[PDB]
Design a protein around this nucleic acid. Structure first.
Ligand SMILES: Nc1ncnc2c1ncn2[C@@H]1O[C@H](COP(=O)(O)CP(=O)(O)OP(=O)(O)O)[C@@H](O)[C@H]1O
Ligand SMILES: [Mg+2]
Ligand SMILES: [Zn+2]
Ligand SMILES: [Zn+2]
Lengths: 43, 133, 181, 147, 263, 114, 30, 65, 56, 392
RNA sequence: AGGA
């Protein structure tokens, strides 16, 4: 329930990759696998 | 139905390369200079150190299931303190009158090299190995 | 945390001091010094992504503030506080993680994907999801009979209510080749 | 599953007498395979266990926080103080024979989660049953009793 | 005195330490197994619910009631319902318990192992009494109620064994060890530098002689002498978990002889 | 749901016998006994005592699948000695040893004050 | 020593106060 | 959610030992490792039962009907 | 591709798999419930008549 | 999926209790099945005609040797592989009691108790000896591994004469799904039915032996010697200097760019190469210090699970992290993270994880490992679709 | 929205 209320969706040049700017803003490991991997980010 | 080889040897080296219960022995015959012996041994059951007198005998007998007790009740064909059973796997011709025979005792390997025991050591699964002292 | 060159006594030192810390914990024991209190006293600040470009951060405070004027072989190999330009300090480096990853014991000892995995499995787990489970009429609901808090915990779990509302049980486990089953 | 990407199914349940045991009379609740560790490099699983083994004896909550000063050598020190062998190994005895195992087992408590995937909620068999209307082919879904 | 010997190291109400000598491991273990698995006990096996206003589920409570240890002293003079000739149950084959509790108090009202009352006839035999080993004499805490929170159940305890369900487990853990000095090499110690240093010494090392390094390997050596600890739950007293284990195993063997006789 | 009844571990089935004795064809004076509603408890016990009988040439036991509470015991004896007799004796030996065990324990237990 | 430098352990007391005030769904609500 | 009767692993009765464990902690000001041990819980299987319990019943009791 | 190249079919079953060291390389453990559902249409022949009469 | 001729095989029904389909472990590889919650499909043929097709063409034993690579697609795996090595060491001897059970367990045993390799003091049989009871009479196999003498001093290679092991330890090379393999020969020589029966036999004996022997793996198996740790720590330290040396050199304009490369391209290749040389060196120090008792080494040895690289990363040092081959880029202006000064090219800044998993990762190390790891999960997700349609 |  907690992780669902802290969820982020990225609609639609390389967004899936874990970017340096994500440090301390979004979880490095919390992403799904497949079509969603790297576009569903968690705070 | 008879014995096949008999001689007394002296231990050069004893080797437990990574093994805890087993050692590969190195020995030469005290009698014939041409005769040497390489053999794997269960040191837990019978320990061996360097420069030991050992009577190494072969023999075909003394082929159906194996019976456990009644050994005192029957003829203990051992006057030896360590007996093994294995197969002959190779007959290496090392020039002249010289020949080498390879014996496997359930993975415990043996290489005996001499010249004279030509009309004895057969290419047989059936061959015992007796050691005393 | 804010770090200032500003210090009568020596070096560039972190604004938040041992006194503020006990002053907060006074309010912790009551259940006057809030989070906003640190924010308005200017001891702590909000840094977005754009502003992060123009700053220099320390990981640890004490461990990364007073310079050198024996070493444990057991610990992981850490760098240094060579920098004198530090503008800010990291409250805690485990705060880089989100809810799911925060329940993982020793994630810094696992191969990164194994964590991306566990961060997706705890959502398929079972336990007490709310204490009013008996009064609510939800389509499908799973409750563990005897939930147990973990024997190995994270300091983050304190804020996540995991100890209060668990998802597992502490099984006595043997890593063994037994019947081959 | 464990908290380390260690998913799995039960393959057999054994009664207490058939299970392997510590001389203390302790028996495992779960038995995981040694092969589940080398390829995976899930070191924290092993540390969790060792830490939790101490935590259960000491009765003090075991901190397994990410960035900390806790060492495998540190936890090991404590376990030996409690009388167990430092690296969490314990001598075990075969349940069927009573004979000592030639090996020592990595035995200790580990947090395991119960997952929403239960066999009886997944098992399905069909041999003639509802057909769609248009295509006149079997319907779809375990729920609808499809093929 | 006879064949296999016994030497009790420490006895109590619920724990027996002893040294079993002049035996085969295969026999100490067969005894180990029986004590866990095959000695009969009495346990609640049917729960009929009349009222429950509790926060717990009818079956959650039901499960707990089974696990509550009951007096199984005279368990031998009770029938297995399977064997008994009645429709369902009776006094020959069961003990009937009752539980009624209601939150009269404003404060949380507790429900205990003691709150159970025998309604059946015990034929003057020591059975069915909930085991209370508790300091304040309460036994197992079954439930908790608030105000109008009521509980009404009728329980039918029956004779059974651990193989059918662990609730009929007469014993908790059973300590078992042999050869504290590894003289038999029945184990190979995992080490880093020294096995002797890294591995703790057993308390049983004191009751056997150290190996003495300057000695050849005793291959002839067989395993006898078993350092054991049997712990009771309460249903049956410690001695009887040992004795009834011996008798159970004995009958189990005797059945095989008798089976051969009919053949 | 696909779960067998727990009593199927110890309670004999409909027209099921404790023992099924068949003669081994591979070896002379050999037999194979199948024990229904029986585990390792009684398996390894009988097997081991048979090993103590000098006239017993071969003895082994096996639980072919853990789902089923039965086991196979193979006995081979010296010509003239019946393997059924070998089992009878090894069984009695067991009972007589347990007999001493019970006696000796009670004797010792009584001596304690706790 | 009311203004003595902070320890690494102290950081948790700060974090503690952040949650006491903000909570885990802060952003949704705000 | 309500103390388990009997340790999962070994089967030692633990159902009685709860109220006392809580007293040894409050009334006797003891630490968990001692309290548990005074109650006889020696094997780690028995220890985790009492030690790692989360008595949720107490929350559920707080709702009127 | 949906209804001709591929099709939903009768006489089909699906469950979780688990390994067994006591099964022969070529056999498959079939849960009783599944066996009691999946049927094979055997013809009444003199060789089976009696056997089939019993399964019925 | 069902990307294989062998992803659909015919089996013999075995009606059993409990709600799961049970399959032999060796059959696991062709299907690509595991038991972390996989499900499978069963199809019942309704004809006498279709049944024949299944038994006569798609039967599991027929599928043993596969045309895809002209070698067996099924072999001994996991527990049985791990235990088959252990059972077959020179050191391994079994006493009568167990030998008799090890025998009765082979469902085809001749009823002949073989003569022990040691007849007094004490009758002892060897692992080799009794495993040979599974190997049928007529199977001849010869193999020479690195420096195998006809006296096989190391218990290297394999010599099986008339279904009897003479020398060599049995593992992945002999019993696995390999070209010269005991399995390839058994099918080719004796039949698919005889070979499939052999699978069962090897596993019934090996599994039984291992049940009673045991096998485990713990943290102890990741721990490396204090001196070996000193040696590894100083190995990384020298590599870090070698890197700094080339770093001062390239900043002083002294570096000479490789033909067909930037001056920078040249430097980075060198930096990346020293760091990797090190990760291996340090990793190679661990695998040497681990005794023959190291359960991890024991699995790497049998080939049942794991390789050098796993020992390396777990015990010694994780290594350099890569995103698109190139080490951690400057996402921030001239730096990888805000805890670094600008224009920092050092291993630590560009993502070299100096620490082992046993030791734990630093927050920088952690996040860099995370960037790298996530790249894999993306490329599996991308490729898994491309690859499926190629097959179509 | 989840599963291998
Ligand atoms: N999207 C997909 N489509 C088809 N098959 C898939 C799939 N995802 C997973 N699989 C199958 O499931 C198998 C297992 O993948 P995972 O469940 O992630 C464990 P693993 O990656 O094999 O590593 P491990 O054995 O060391 O644990 C794959 O090898 C593949 O056949
Ligand atoms: Mg899988
Ligand atoms: Zn009755
Ligand atoms: Zn316990």
């Amino acid at each position: 329930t907690l992780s669902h209320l802290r969820r982020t969706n990225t609609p639609i040049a390389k967004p899936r990759q874990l970017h340096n700017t994500h440090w301390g803003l979004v979880c490095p490991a919390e992403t799904p696998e497949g079509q969603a991997c790297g576009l569903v980010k968690n705070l | 139905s008879n014995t096949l080889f008999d001689d007394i040897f002296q231990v050069s080296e004893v080797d437990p390369g990574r093994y805890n219960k087993v050692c590969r022995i190195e020995a030469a015959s005290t009698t014939q200079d041409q005769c040497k012996l390489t053999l794997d041994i269960n040191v837990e059951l019978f320990p061996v150190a360097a420069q030991d007198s050992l009577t190494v005998t072969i023999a075909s007998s003394l082929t159906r299931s194996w019976r456990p007790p009644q050994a005192g009740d029957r003829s203990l064909a051992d006057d030896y303190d360590y007996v093994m059973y294995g197969t002959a796997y190779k007959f290496e011709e090392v020039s002249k009158d010289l020949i080498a025979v390879y014996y496997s005792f359930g993975g415990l390997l043996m290489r005996l090299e001499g010249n004279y025991r030509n009309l004895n050591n057969l290419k047989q699964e059936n061959a015992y190995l007796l050691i005393r002292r | 945390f804010i770090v200032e060159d500003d210090e009568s006594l020596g070096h560039k030192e972190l604004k938040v001091r041992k006194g503020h810390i006990a002053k907060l914990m006074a309010t912790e024991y009551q259940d006057e010094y809030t989070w906003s209190s640190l924010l308005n006293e200017g001891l702590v600040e909000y840094i977005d992504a754009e502003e992060e470009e123009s700053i220099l951060i320390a990981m640890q405070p004490e461990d990364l503030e007073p310079a050198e004027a024996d070493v444990d072989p057991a610990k992981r190999i850490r760098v240094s506080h060579h920098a004198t330009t530090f503008t800010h300090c990291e409250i805690h480096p485990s705060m880089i993680l989100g809810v799911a990853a925060s329940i993982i014991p020793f994630p810094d000892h696992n191969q990164s994907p194994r964590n991306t995995y566990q961060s997706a499995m705890g959502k398929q787990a079972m336990g007490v999801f709310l204490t009013n489970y008996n009064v609510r009429m939800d389509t499908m609901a799973n409750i563990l009979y005897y939930p147990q808090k973990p024997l190995g915990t994270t300091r983050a779990m304190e804020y996540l209510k995991f100890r209060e509302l668990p998802a597992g049980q502490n099984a006595i486990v043997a890593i063994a080749c037994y019947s081959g089953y | 599953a464990s908290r380390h990407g260690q998913k799995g199914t039960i393959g057999i349940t054994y009664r207490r007498e058939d299970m392997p045991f510590t001389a203390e009379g302790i028996v495992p609740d779960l038995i995981i395979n040694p092969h589940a560790i080398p390829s995976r490099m899930t070191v924290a699983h092993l540390i969790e266990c060792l830490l939790s083994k101490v935590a259960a004896l000491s009765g003090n909550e075991g901190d397994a926080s990410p960035f900390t000063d806790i060492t495998v050598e540190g936890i090991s020190k404590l376990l030996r103080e409690h009388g167990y062998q430092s690296r969490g190994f314990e001598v075990m005895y075969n349940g069927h024979t009573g004979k000592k195992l030639m090996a020592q087992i990595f035995f200790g408590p580990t947090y395991y989660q119960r997952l929403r995937h239960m066999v009886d909620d997944k098992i399905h068999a069909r041999a003639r049953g509802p057909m769609q209307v248009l295509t006149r082919q079997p319907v779809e879904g375990r729920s609808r009793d499809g093929g | 005195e006879e064949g296999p010997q016994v030497k009790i190291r420490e006895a109590s109400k619920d724990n027996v330490d002893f040294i079993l000598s002049n035996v085969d491991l295969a026999m100490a273990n067969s005894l180990r197994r029986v004590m866990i698995a095959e000695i009969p006990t009495l346990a609640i096996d049917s729960v009929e619910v009349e009222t429950n206003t509790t926060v717990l589920a009818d079956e959650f409570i039901a499960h707990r009631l089974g696990l509550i240890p009951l007096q199984s002293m005279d368990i031998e003079q009770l029938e297995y319902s399977r064997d008994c000739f009645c429709e369902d149950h009776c006094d020959k084959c069961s003990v009937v318990l009752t539980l009624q509790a209601f939150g009269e108090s404003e404060s949380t009202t507790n429900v205990y192992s003691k709150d159970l009352v025998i309604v059946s006839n015990l034929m003057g035999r020591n059975i069915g009494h909930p085991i209370i080993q508790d300091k304040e004499g309460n036994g197992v805490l079954i439930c908790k109620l608030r105000k109008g929170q009521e509980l009404k159940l009728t329980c039918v305890a029956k004779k059974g064994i651990a193989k059918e369900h662990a609730k009929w487990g007469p014993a908790a853990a059973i300590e078992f060890e042999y050869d504290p000095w590894n003289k038999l090499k029945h184990t190979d110690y995992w080490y880093e530098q020294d096995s002797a240093k890294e591995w703790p010494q057993s308390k049983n090392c004191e009751y056997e002689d150290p190996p003495n390094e300057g000695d050849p390997f005793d291959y002839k050596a067989q395993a006898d002498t078993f350092y054991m600890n049997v712990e009771s739950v309460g249903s049956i007293p410690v001695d009887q978990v040992v004795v009834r284990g011996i008798d159970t195993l004995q009958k189990k063997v005797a059945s095989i002889l008798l089976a051969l006789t009919q053949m | 749901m696909n779960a067998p009844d727990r009593f199927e571990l110890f309670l004999l089935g409909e027209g099921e016998s404790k023992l099924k004795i068949d003669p081994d064809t591979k070896a002379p004076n050999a037999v194979v006994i199948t024990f229904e509603k029986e585990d390792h408890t009684l398996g390894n016990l009988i097997r081991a005592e048979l090993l103590n009988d000098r006239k017993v040439l071969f003895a082994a036991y096996k639980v072919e699948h853990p789902f089923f509470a039965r086991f196979k015991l193979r006995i081979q004896t010296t010509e003239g000695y019946d393997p059924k007799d070998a089992l009878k004796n090894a069984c009695n030996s067991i009972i007589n040893k347990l007999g001493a065990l019970k006696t000796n324990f009670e004797t010792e237990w009584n001596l304690q004050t706790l | 020593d009311e203004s003595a430098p902070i320890t690494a352990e102290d950081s948790w007391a700060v974090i503690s106060a952040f949650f006491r005030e903000k909570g885990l769904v802060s952003q949704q609500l705000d | 959610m309500i103390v388990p009767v009997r340790c999962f692993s070994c089967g030692k009765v633990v159902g009685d030992k709860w109220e006392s464990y809580l007293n040894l902690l409050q009334e006797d000001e003891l630490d968990e490792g001692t309290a548990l041990s005074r109650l006889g819980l020696k094997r780690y299987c028995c220890r985790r039962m009492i030690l790692t319990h989360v008595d949720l019943i107490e929350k559920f009791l707080r709702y009127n009907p | 591709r949906g209804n001709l190249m591929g099709k939903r079919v009768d006489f089909s079953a699906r469950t979780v798999i688990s390994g067994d060291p006591n099964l022969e390389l070529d056999q498959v453990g079939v849960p009783k419930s599944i066996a009691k559902t999946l049927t094979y249409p055997e013809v009444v022949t003199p060789y089976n008549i009696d056997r089939l009469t019993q399964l019925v | 999926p069902s990307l294989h001729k062998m992803s659909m095989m015919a089996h013999r029904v075995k009606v059993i209790p409990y709600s799961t389909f049970r399959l032999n472990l060796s059959v696991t590889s062709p299907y690509n099945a595991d038991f972390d919650g996989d499900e499978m499909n069963l199809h019942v043929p309704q004809s006498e005609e279709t049944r024949a097709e299944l038994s006569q063409l798609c039967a599991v034993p027929l599928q043993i040797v596969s045309p895809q690579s002209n070698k067996p697609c099924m072999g001994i795996v996991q527990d049985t592989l791990c235990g088959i090595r252990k059972l077959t060491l020179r050191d391994t001897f079994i006493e009568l009691d167990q030998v008799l059970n090890m025998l009765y367990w082979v469902p085809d045993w001749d009823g002949v108790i073989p003569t022990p390799a040691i007849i007094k003091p004490k009758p002892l049989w060897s692992g080799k000896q009794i495993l040979s009871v599974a190997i049928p009479n007529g199977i001849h196999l010869q193999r020479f591994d690195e420096g195998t003498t006809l006296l096989s001093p190391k218990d290297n290679g394999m010599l099986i004469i008339d279904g009897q092991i003479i020398f060599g330890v049995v593992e992945k090379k002999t019993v696995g799904s390999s070209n010269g393999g005991l399995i390839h020969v058994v099918t080719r020589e004796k039949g698919p039915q005889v070979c499939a029966k052999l699978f069962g036999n090897i596993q019934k004996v090996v599994n039984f032996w291992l049940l009673h022997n045991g096998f485990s793996t713990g943290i102890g198996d990741t721990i490396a010697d204090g001196p070996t740790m000193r040696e590894i720590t100083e190995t990384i330290a020298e590599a870090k200097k070698k890197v700094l040396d080339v770093t001062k050199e390239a900043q002083a304009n002294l570096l000479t760019a490789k033909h067909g490369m930037t001056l920078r391209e040249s430097f980075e290749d060198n930096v990346v190469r020293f760091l990797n040389e090190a990760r291996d060196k340090a990793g190679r120090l661990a695998e040497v210090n681990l005794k023959d008792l190291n359960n991890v080494k024991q699995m790497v040895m049998a080939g049942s699970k794991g390789s050098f690289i796993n020992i390396a990363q777990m015990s010694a040092c994780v290594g350099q992290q890569s995103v698109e081959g190139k080490r951690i880029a400057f996402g921030f202006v001239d730096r990888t993270l805000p805890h670094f000064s600008k224009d920092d090219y050092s291993p630590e800044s560009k993502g070299f994880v100096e620490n082992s998993y046993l030791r734990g990762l630093t927050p920088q190390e952690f996040f860099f490992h995370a960037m790298g790891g996530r790249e894999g999960l993306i490329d599996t997700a991308v490729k898994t679709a491309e690859t499926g349609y190629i097959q179509r």
